[PDB]
Subunit: 127 residues, 4 copies
């Protein structure tokens, strides 16, 4: 649907859960970078998790080209605002998106102070 920037049929979605409260991790900053030609990391998109703990509308299909991306979840300020001191500075996820035709990626993350898991769920663009 929408082309350029925005939501569209969300080709990239992020979900954060809180393993200490058993609730969605609300208002967590997410920073997406893409591997640019000079090998450095260029800012691709950014956003905060909603009440449901999800971040949609990060990019559109026409913008989400092949490449390597890194999803940075700023987990530390999340715990610090909770008064808890955490171990990691953030949690990043690096991958090759789109090198065999367009896909949908759902990057899910379970959080705890001294531990974290990440899972991706990829699907082939359906109606």
């Amino acid at each position: 649907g929408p082309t350029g920037t925005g939501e569209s049929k969300c080709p990239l979605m992020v979900k954060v859960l809180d393993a200490v409260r058993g609730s969605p991790a609300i208002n967590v900053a997410v920073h997406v970078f893409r591997k640019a030609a000079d090998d450095t990391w260029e800012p691709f998109a950014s956003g905060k998790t909603s009440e449901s703990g999800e971040l949609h509308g990060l990019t559109t299909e026409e913008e989400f080209v092949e490449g390597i991306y890194k999803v940075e979840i700023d987990t530390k300020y999340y715990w610090k605002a909770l008064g808890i001191s955490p171990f990691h500075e953030h949690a990043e996820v690096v991958f090759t998106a789109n090198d065999s035709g367009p896909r949908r990626y759902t990057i899910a993350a379970l959080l705890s102070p001294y531990s974290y898991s990440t899972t991706a769920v990829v699907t082939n663009p359906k109606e």
Copy 2:
């Protein structure tokens, strides 16, 4: 809404993901038991995961009384149909539901052959 048996505003929902394929764990058997008065386990409800890897309509609010329940995910036949031999016979989750007023429980599970994580997300009945 609906009272007795069925879906309603789903007071108990289950979600299974596949950590080896990066996809929803489809058609996995889920068996829910409740701690009956004689301490044994009585069958409460059952179902299979859908295409989205979720199981809804297990019970209604009026039926989901306080108590201890065990959600059995029959992970082994899941992997065996995939030709993979797994380590656990199944994955169960035991908890005390409703001892402080009604809640909604989303039991999520990430699966792998020799490992598995489970997370619950509980919320207070909203509109």
Copy 3:
């Protein structure tokens, strides 16, 4: 020797870690069970996790035969001492032991108030 029910060779070890504090879980109660004839759970061995979070010397090679064992780790109380109300009554791991050999089974567990991940590390013994 010591054999019977003690370290010796250790065919089964239990490791419990605390994901909120970033430390091992000391004094968690663990109760191993074996599946009996009339399909019930007969008490096998038990103990408490040490200050390093590992539980050694539960059974031995001569007594540890092929079958279905159940490792139930008592987490609720663990969290309770910590002044934390957890979601689970406990954590259990149901598996078919031995098969083609006594080998070595390590059961790992990572706990959070609302989550637990488990892993079995079955490796070949030589000493």
Copy 4:
């Protein structure tokens, strides 16, 4: 001694486990980095995981000072040897080391084609 860059006291250990095979991950490449002045990543230490999946003797107490270190574990290739196409380029763990002490840091990681969980076990040394 050995100090400098070797076991000795081991302020930082790396543990890599394979959740698909139920075994430790042997020969995974791990590269530790330290955050430098001009906020970049200066190579610190590196090596390969042993047959038990642990990587010992990376740095030592005198050389391991307060700061931001980065443990990047090269998983993609690991899975590749296994004839499995993974989702991640690698796994990294970004953390502030030392603070109030050299202590001991254990970085645990559990891998799957589409997932990885990580945990830091920072415990008090006495030997």
